[PDB]
Write a protein that binds this ligand. Structure first.
Ligand code: ZK7
Ligand code: ZN
Length: 188
């Protein structure tokens, strides 16, 4: 079956807000056909397979997500199922050509230490950068709050993309792992 856009997250100036466009019944049927006529908008898509929901982030003209969510699946589109352009399991990274109407985030060149994880609810969670692929949460959170947010963006204060959220370190989450925008460009 195909990955399906079921909603999205829009970044408005210094804010993010979510919208739902599809429920479980529509997700299951569109996953089967791979045919999706819904208009696309936003930098972050809420995506779903038959059985898992997660996020996808547009960067550099590619809609990126995690392999552990998408597998090798196509993504539903107005012209039917679209094959992945990029698949790297070692990076836990897949990507498809970005849908017409999504807006690509700008890769960050700030070097900032303050990062902001966007969750699937448009919650913006502060994070302290610790290198290029890890971040420490300012307040620990039950991992429940972060589940379903893989493939969403870490942003810098200016709103640029720093990386794709991959996994969380926990024992309550204390830290997060993300794929740096630099690794996406190397893949590309
Ligand atoms: C099948 O072929 C594959 C190929 C490559 C691959 N690569 C990774 C790293 C992987 O890991 C899985 C899924 C990740 C996940 O849960 N991702 C988040 C998420 O939201 N997923 S999701 O959207 O709910 C879902 C599953 C898509 C629907 C974003 C978190 C939020 C909450 C975590 C809840 C407890 C989990 C804590 C765990 N911790 C961790 O693995 O930490 C490490 C670190 F210590 F950081 F190094 C990475 C290696 C160890 C974790 O994050 N995952 C476990 N599976 C695969 C599988
Ligand atoms: Zn920046």
């Amino acid at each position: 079956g195909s990955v399906v856009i079921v909603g999205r997250i829009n970044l408005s100036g210094d804010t993010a807000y979510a919208q739902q466009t599809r429920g479980e019944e529509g997700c299951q049927e569109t996953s089967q056909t791979g045919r999706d006529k819904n208009q696309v908008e936003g930098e972050v898509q809420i995506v779903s397979t038959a059985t898992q929901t997660f996020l996808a982030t547009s960067i550099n003209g590619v809609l990126w997500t995690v392999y552990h969510g998408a597998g090798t699946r196509t993504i539903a589109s107005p012209k039917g199922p679209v094959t992945q352009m990029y698949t790297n399991v070692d990076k836990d990274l897949v990507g498809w050509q970005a849908p017409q109407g999504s807006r690509s985030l700008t890769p960050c060149t700030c070097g900032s230490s303050d990062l902001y994880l966007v969750t699937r609810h448009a919650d913006v969670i502060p994070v302290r950068r610790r290198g290029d692929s890890r971040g420490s949460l300012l307040s620990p959170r039950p991992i429940s709050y972060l589940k379903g947010s893989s493939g969403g963006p870490l942003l810098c204060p200016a709103g640029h993309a720093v990386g794709i959220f991959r996994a969380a370190v926990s024992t309550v989450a204390k830290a997060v792992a993300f794929i740096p925008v630099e690794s996406l460009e190397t893949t590309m």
